């Protein structure tokens, strides 16, 4: 069973910097020290 | 039933299939032979061809690593799936002969 929330609080984004974060794997292949 | 051939049904199988560096997972039907630990042969461990010299070898692979990689791009040690062994694969060419 769903509710719909009661009390609530306006919900509001903050806002800052990702920095050097996110970063993954762009490709399946398989590299060594490697620098691409 | 009685339709134009170009009306009448055909299955399709689009086998997408990668090979990695993962442990391999479907293989041919290639029968395994013994293995030749001194001299230059030609070797295919799962599907990676080659011809060069295969040694004992100490590198220490990832758990589910089946080949490691030179500068180049060029496979120097290989996990044989059998025996689990890593095995530094070596040139048969000798450079430096005068
Ligand atoms: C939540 O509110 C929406 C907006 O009217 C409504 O359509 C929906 O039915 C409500 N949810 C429940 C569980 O009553
Ligand atoms: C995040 O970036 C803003 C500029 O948009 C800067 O003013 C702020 O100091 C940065 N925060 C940190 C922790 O570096
Ligand atoms: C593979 O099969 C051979 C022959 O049955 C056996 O000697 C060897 O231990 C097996 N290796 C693995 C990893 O199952």
């Known amino acids: 069973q769903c509710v719909n929330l009661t009390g609530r609080a306006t919900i509001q984004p903050s806002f800052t910097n990702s920095s050097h974060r996110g970063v993954y794997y762009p490709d399946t292949i398989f590299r060594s020290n490697s620098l691409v | 039933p009685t339709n134009g051939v170009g009306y009448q049904p055909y299955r399709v199988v689009v086998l997408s299939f990668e090979l990695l560096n993962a442990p391999a997972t479907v293989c041919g039907p ?49 996990r044989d799936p059998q025996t689990l062994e890593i095995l530094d694969i070596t040139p048969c060419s000798f450079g430096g002969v005068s």
């Open chain 2, 30 to 78: 290639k029968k395994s032979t013994n293995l030749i630990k001194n001299k230059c042969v030609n070797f295919n461990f799962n599907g990676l061809t080659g011809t060069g010299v295969l040694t004992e070898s100490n590198k220490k692979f990832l758990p589910f690593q089946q080949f490691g990689r030179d500068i180049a791009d060029t496979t120097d040690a290989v």
